[PDB]
């Protein structure tokens, strides 16, 4: 109960990385269709894809902090 609910509770918090996983494929997907429209690749466009993968893995890092709080 005390060692049980923290072992099944740390597993439910790992379903918060399904958002950052597909959220990283879209921000890197629209940059693939964006650089297809060309040509400001280096700087502007591909420099914003880092700003879009950072605000998406911020909820991932917030979810990976929760699953590690019930694991340690």
């Amino acid at each position: 109960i005390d060692t049980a609910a923290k072992f099944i509770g740390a597993g439910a918090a790992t379903v918060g990385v399904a958002g950052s996983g597909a959220g990283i494929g879209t921000v890197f997907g629209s940059l693939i269709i964006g650089y297809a429209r060309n040509p400001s690749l280096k700087q502007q466009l591909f420099s914003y894809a880092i700003l879009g993968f950072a605000l998406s893995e911020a909820m991932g890092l917030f979810c990976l902090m929760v699953a590690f709080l019930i694991l340690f």
Binding site: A36, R37, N38, P39, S40, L41
Partner: protein, 131 residues
């Protein structure tokens, strides 16, 4: 770089000038043709053209219609039916026209006419953009 050819039958403003961008009132509305913008063919809308020329300039324009052409080649062709720098339009006229135009729309009664008035109205709008 992109070589911008800006002309009207009346005038050539730029002729394949190394402009970095021209943002176009194509019937797309726009697509702001970048030097790295896929070649593309466009019919021009009435709106404004802004010529971001690699020179710290964006130059202002209204074009009525025509076609713009983005070649594969570095050249972009604004072939503006009426091509103006916003510089020569008449604001006063626009408003005045616009009321009138709408009015006529109120009396427009062929699909075409309606279209036309509306066109006109719109025209005044697309002018109104600037104006």
């Amino acid at each position: 770089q992109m070589s911008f050819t800006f002309a009207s039958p009346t005038q050539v403003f730029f002729n394949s000038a190394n402009v970095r961008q021209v943002d176009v009132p194509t019937q797309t509305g726009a697509f702001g043709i970048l030097a790295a913008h896929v070649p593309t063919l466009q019919v021009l809308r009435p709106g404004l053209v802004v010529v971001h020329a690699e020179d710290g300039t964006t130059s202002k324009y209204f074009v009525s219609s025509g076609s713009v052409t983005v070649n594969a080649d570095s050249s972009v062709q604004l072939l503006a039916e009426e091509a103006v720098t916003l510089d020569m339009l008449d604001l006063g006229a626009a408003k005045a026209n616009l009321e009138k135009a709408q009015s006529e729309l109120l009396g427009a009664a062929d699909e075409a006419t309606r279209a036309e008035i509306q066109i006109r109205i719109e025209a005044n709008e697309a002018l109104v953009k600037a104006l």
